[PDB]
Design a protein around this ligand. Structure first.
Ligand SMILES: Cc1cn([C@H]2C[C@H](O)[C@@H](COP(=O)(O)O)O2)c(=O)[nH]c1=O
Ligand SMILES: [Mn+2]
Ligand SMILES: [Mn+2]
Length: 174
């Protein structure tokens, strides 16, 4: 199975570990088998117990109030692991999301191993940069390059972004 994944967070750090002190607020993952979307996805919004930084809010528009009644990462971790285990994770700038995932997994104090020990990790941004050296390779740039619709992406969304990346990646490898 190939799982195309994306996450939205409360923000990120420009110095040191990018995830330190921040939290995942949305996880969006799409399943692809034999180069075909199966339709069986994973999508959750999470309660961070901290505020979303202004910069981050300017990107996804997810309000603090909307997350108050959501599950915590700890409450979705088991099913999340059951969903991704053994698959090839396809993520645009993989180190970003994997960093947050391993960070959140570590806070659970359950001795959960690193994601890349039970999942194969493919950085689709590295793949794109290799195929299109010297060109723009943001997800939006790739959407234009492969004629994928991102008109509903004024504000980024984890599932929205994962779905778009799935289409882009299938075309890139098609
Ligand atoms: C693009 C961008 C993302 N981020 C963080 C917070 C977002 O929820 C997360 C999602 O990035 P994404 O929409 O590119 O997948 O990255 C920032 O802090 N500042 C930015 O300028
Ligand atoms: Mn992303
Ligand atoms: Mn996103």
């Amino acid at each position: 199975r190939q799982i195309v994944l994306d996450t939205e967070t409360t923000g990120m750090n420009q110095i040191g570990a990018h995830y330190e002190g921040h939290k995942i607020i949305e996880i969006g993952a799409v399943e692809v088998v034999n180069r075909r979307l199966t339709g069986n996805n994973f999508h959750v919004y999470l309660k961070p117990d901290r505020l979303v930084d202004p910069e981050a809010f300017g990107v996804h528009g997810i309000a603090d109030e909307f997350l108050l009644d959501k599950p915590t990462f700890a409450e979705v971790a088991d099913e999340f692991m059951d969903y991704i285990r053994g698959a090839e994770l396809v993520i645009h700038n993989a180190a970003f999301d994997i960093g947050f995932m391993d960070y959140e997994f570590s806070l659970l104090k359950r001795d959960i191993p690193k994601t890349n020990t039970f999942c194969k990790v493919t950085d689709s941004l590295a793949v794109a940069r290799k195929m299109f050296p010297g060109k723009r390779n943001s997800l939006d740039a790739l959407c234009a390059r492969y004629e994928i619709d991102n008109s509903k992406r004024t504000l980024h969304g984890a599932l929205l972004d994962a779905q778009i990346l799935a289409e882009v990646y299938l075309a890139m490898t098609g």
